[PDB]
C-alpha cells in the first residue's frame, strides 16, 4: 500500500527526467564544441576567432 | 482426568485442535495514517 518509500520512489522519479535533461543537454553541447574542435581551427579572421572563443565560452558557462 | 488437567495435557490439546491447525492466524492509533490523505500526494 501506499507509504513512505513510495512517495519517496515517485518523488525521485519525477525528478530524475531533470537529470535525464541535464545530460542530454550536457551531450548535445558537446557534440556542439566537438563539431567546433574536429572541424578547422583556422582563426585567420578575426572576427570568426571572436565569435568561436565566445561560443566556447557561453557553453562553459551554461 | 485431573492429572491431565494438571499436566497441562488438555490445554495443550485445545490449542493444537483449535490453533495449530486453523486456517487463520494466531492473533490501535487514531492518529491520521497516509492512506487518508494518499489522493493529495498523487
Request: proline fraction near 2%.
Given at each position: 500500500?501506499?507509504?513512505?518509500?513510495?512517495?519517496?520512489?515517485?518523488?525521485?522519479?519525477?525528478?530524475?527526467?531533470?537529470?535525464?535533461?541535464?545530460?542530454?543537454?550536457?551531450?548535445?553541447?558537446?557534440?556542439?564544441?566537438?563539431?567546433?574542435?574536429?572541424?578547422?581551427?583556422?582563426?585567420?579572421?578575426?572576427?570568426?576567432?571572436?565569435?568561436?572563443?565566445?561560443?566556447?565560452?557561453?557553453?562553459?558557462?551554461? | 482426568?485431573?492429572?491431565?488437567?494438571?499436566?497441562?495435557?488438555?490445554?495443550?490439546?485445545?490449542?493444537?485442535?483449535?490453533?495449530?491447525?486453523?486456517?487463520?492466524?494466531?492473533?490501535?492509533?487514531?492518529?491520521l495514517s497516509?492512506?487518508?490523505?494518499?489522493?493529495?500526494?498523487?
Amino acid at each position: 500500500a501506499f507509504t513512505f518509500a513510495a512517495f519517496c520512489y515517485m518523488l525521485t522519479l519525477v525528478l530524475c527526467a531533470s537529470l535525464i535533461f541535464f545530460v542530454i543537454w550536457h551531450i548535445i553541447a558537446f557534440d556542439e564544441l566537438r563539431t567546433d574542435f574536429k572541424n578547422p581551427i583556422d582563426q585567420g579572421n578575426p572576427a570568426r576567432a571572436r565569435e568561436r572563443l565566445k561560443n566556447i565560452e557561453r557553453i562553459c558557462c551554461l | 482426568v485431573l492429572k491431565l488437567s494438571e499436566q497441562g495435557v488438555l490445554d495443550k490439546l485445545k490449542s493444537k485442535w483449535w490453533y495449530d491447525k486453523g486456517e487463520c492466524g494466531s492473533k490501535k492509533t487514531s492518529a491520521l495514517s497516509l492512506s487518508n490523505v494518499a489522493g493529495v500526494f498523487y
